[PDB]
Design a protein around this ligand. Sequence first.
Ligand code: MG
Ligand code: MG
Ligand code: MG
Ligand code: MG
Ligand code: MG
Ligand code: MG
Ligand code: MG
Ligand code: MG
Ligand code: MG
Ligand code: MG
Ligand code: MG
Ligand code: MG
Ligand code: MG
Ligand code: MG
Ligand code: MG
Ligand code: MG
Ligand code: MG
Ligand code: MG
Ligand code: MG
Ligand code: MG
Ligand code: MG
Ligand code: MG
Ligand code: MG
Ligand code: MG
Ligand code: MG
Ligand code: MG
Ligand code: MG
Lengths: 63, 59, 153, 402
Amino acid sequence: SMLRLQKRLASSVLRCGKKKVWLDPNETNEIANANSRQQIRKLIKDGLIIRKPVTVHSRARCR
Amino acid sequence: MKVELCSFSGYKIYPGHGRRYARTDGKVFQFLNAKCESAFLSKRNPRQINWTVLYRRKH
Amino acid sequence: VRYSLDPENPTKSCKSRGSNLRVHFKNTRETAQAIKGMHIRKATKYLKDVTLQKQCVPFRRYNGGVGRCAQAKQWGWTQGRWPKKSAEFLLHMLKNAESNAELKGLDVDSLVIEHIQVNKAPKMRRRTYRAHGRINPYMSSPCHIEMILTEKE
Amino acid sequence: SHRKFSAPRHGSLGFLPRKRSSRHRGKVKSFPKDDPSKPVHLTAFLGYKAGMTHIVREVDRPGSKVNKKEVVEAVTIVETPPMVVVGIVGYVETPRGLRTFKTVFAEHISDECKRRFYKNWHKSKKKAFTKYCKKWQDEDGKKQLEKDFSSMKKYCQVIRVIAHTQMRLLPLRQKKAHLMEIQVNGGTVAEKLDWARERLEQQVPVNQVFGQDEMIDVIGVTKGKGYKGVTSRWHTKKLPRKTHRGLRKVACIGAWHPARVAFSVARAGQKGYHHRTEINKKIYKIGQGYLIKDGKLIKNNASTDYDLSDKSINPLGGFVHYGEVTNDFVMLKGCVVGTKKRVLTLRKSLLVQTKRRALEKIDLKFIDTTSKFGHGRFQTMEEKKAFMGPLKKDRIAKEEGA
RNA sequence: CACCCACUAAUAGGGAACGUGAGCUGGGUUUAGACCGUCGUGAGACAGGUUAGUUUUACCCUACUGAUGAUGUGUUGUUGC
RNA sequence: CCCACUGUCCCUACCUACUAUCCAGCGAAACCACAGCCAAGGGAACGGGCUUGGCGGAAUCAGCGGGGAAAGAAGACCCUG
RNA sequence: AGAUCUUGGUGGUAGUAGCAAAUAUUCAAACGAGAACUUUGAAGGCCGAAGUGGAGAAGGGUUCCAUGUGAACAGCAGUUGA
Ligand SMILES: [Mg+2]
Ligand SMILES: [Mg+2]
Ligand SMILES: [Mg+2]
Ligand SMILES: [Mg+2]
Ligand SMILES: [Mg+2]
Ligand SMILES: [Mg+2]
Ligand SMILES: [Mg+2]
Ligand SMILES: [Mg+2]
Ligand SMILES: [Mg+2]
Ligand SMILES: [Mg+2]
Ligand SMILES: [Mg+2]
Ligand SMILES: [Mg+2]
Ligand SMILES: [Mg+2]
Ligand SMILES: [Mg+2]
Ligand SMILES: [Mg+2]
Ligand SMILES: [Mg+2]
Ligand SMILES: [Mg+2]
Ligand SMILES: [Mg+2]
Ligand SMILES: [Mg+2]
Ligand SMILES: [Mg+2]
Ligand SMILES: [Mg+2]
Ligand SMILES: [Mg+2]
Ligand SMILES: [Mg+2]
Ligand SMILES: [Mg+2]
Ligand SMILES: [Mg+2]
Ligand SMILES: [Mg+2]
Ligand SMILES: [Mg+2]
């Protein structure tokens, strides 16, 4: 239903921002049950939460 | 059925079209439209503008 | 409960009521005036059309500033609107009254809205903040509604 | 106190109900004075404003700086396909004005005309005049029509013909014909009744109504401009930049007394779409329209006797926002009220043309057919082709299909 | 007001709450700051001069401007006076 | 005061954004003897009402700033105590 | 019946003024009775390190954090919320 808590916890576990947290839209219900950082940790290992890569800011044009 | 004129771009100007420019030096030009006129006023060379007659004849 | 305009015989009739409904009184009064005397199936289709902005309700009494529309020409009027909340509220009241007829065992395919009335409810107080450190009311104008339907065909 | 310096007022008070015209067609409102010595003729016509262009001609005004000189002049093309006479109206002069004595309608009213009687032709069953036309064939109906024609003969002063345009000959989206009453002038009531009777169901071209270089009057509705402020509507002076509430206003709308706003004060409201008549519009040409004998004969539309070029009045790329002119047309001189494809009423002049400005023969030299959808510079397709030569689009056309 | 320059057929005189500030402007007059001259012992004054100085509200009735409509001709439409 | 510069002006036009506008939802306040079409008359000497005349046709929308000597403040000017 | 009387209540105005400062939203799905406003994902943007970022002092005082509700409040709505 609502994943405001899980996005906040996943950010803290991944040591990234909420910008870079990817909660799988297919497994909304599975993520919704994870109400603790330990269940979040297993979600990240299993692949239901992915830390997205940094937005590209290339310096090739400057180089 | 009047005199038939030719522009800065070499195009044929039918009566009732375009403008006429008489400089102080005594020479008179006729233009077909403000595109051709402002090209001439900014001293652009018609031999380097591709759609101009003098370019087509040159190349 | 005490209704106004009890029917000529409450054996072919059913009633619905609502108190302190959160709709504008002026809007609901105009909508109730439009559907009065209508066949129940006609009022159902009409109030659905008002939500879809296919038929307008004519604003006759409370028409200060109300704009003109082409659909007002179905009525004899010039000003009309399409109050969605008033149509929604009267639709729920019509479904409630229809179900009451099912309880009373009389056929619902011939009901006609013989009586309908919108009363002003006690107001609800809110607050608005104005220019030089002043407060003015932001009151709401809820309304009571009642209706009586009868068998006739 | 008096205003410091005198200045004329803005706008004329002779058009004061500055409202949307109650009509769209444009009413004649005055037909020329009827006299019996002249032959029988029609006094009006209906055309459509096709567009504008300019011409070149030789002026014959002695004592002028343009005498024996070439000039260019703006002209307005008005498409005038032949109208169809479908009825006759009698009028009787009462001490309260004219009143419509009797109307007689011809058999076989065309479908384009019968559209005028319906707000919704699509859902209609097209029953208009179906029982009326039945009386043209039975004995009691025909005998009644004879009695109604004879009653017009002995009781009516002026008679008019109902005529309608043929909208199917126009490129417009509208298929509904325009009806109008056209007064028949020039003769006894019996004579104009016999003339109009034989024209029933027939076609009346513009050649038989108007003539070359005669001054006529154009009646129609102007372009709409919507709601407009006083600066656009009455052309009043703008207030300075420093004005608080705004500067496109009239500063003083009246003195303290008479304590009311006068009708003569410029105020914001509807501008445009007004019914106006303009007099003394000279006819420069009457085109022949398109005609097929063995091929499509198009040249004489815009071929002057000095041009001798095969081209029509149509510009290159067609008239902007109107379409292609194919029927007969009338080339008026100067601007004319209205938008494009706006129905115009053309009326015989109420005055008598005696000045040298009128009764001056027109002798065209050149008719501009360059594209009006931009800065056109070629009169015809063939002139454009000869100047530019073959292009890439025509190269692959001659390459793919050989 | 006045006077001057120039054009013009002529460059007439006035009223409308000394027309017209919910139309404007704020130059002047007519607040508070300040300078000079004159008067006053002084606070201060000056149809004496000078400089800086907040211009609010309309959505109400009518008027006017436009825009739908309304009466009655059985309904409705076209053309008209 | 001069050069330059320009929509300050001659002389206005066009474009863009947000509004205003229409709709869904929500929803005030100022003000209010009664109200609201005028000419003249007389009258607390400038009437919406009174007299005499002109007349008067539901219900309304968008504007408007002529009036309501419009609203805002028991006039700060002047006089009296 | 009056006192720009006191207190309380109610009208017209009026469904009117207005809900116009700081560029901007869109598609699909989920839960849900109900989605312009909630959640997720995909886009398009903004703050642009003197930030619309991460932390404190004063002041607040439990607003912090979970779960639940949909009465009232959050000047539309809400499945959301200080
Ligand atoms: Mg406020
Ligand atoms: Mg405050
Ligand atoms: Mg004068
Ligand atoms: Mg006059
Ligand atoms: Mg100002
Ligand atoms: Mg063009
Ligand atoms: Mg004055
Ligand atoms: Mg004033
Ligand atoms: Mg003012
Ligand atoms: Mg000043
Ligand atoms: Mg001072
Ligand atoms: Mg001294
Ligand atoms: Mg001095
Ligand atoms: Mg200053
Ligand atoms: Mg109003
Ligand atoms: Mg408004
Ligand atoms: Mg009076
Ligand atoms: Mg006092
Ligand atoms: Mg006082
Ligand atoms: Mg009392
Ligand atoms: Mg009181
Ligand atoms: Mg509003
Ligand atoms: Mg707004
Ligand atoms: Mg940026
Ligand atoms: Mg920070
Ligand atoms: Mg919280
Ligand atoms: Mg709310």
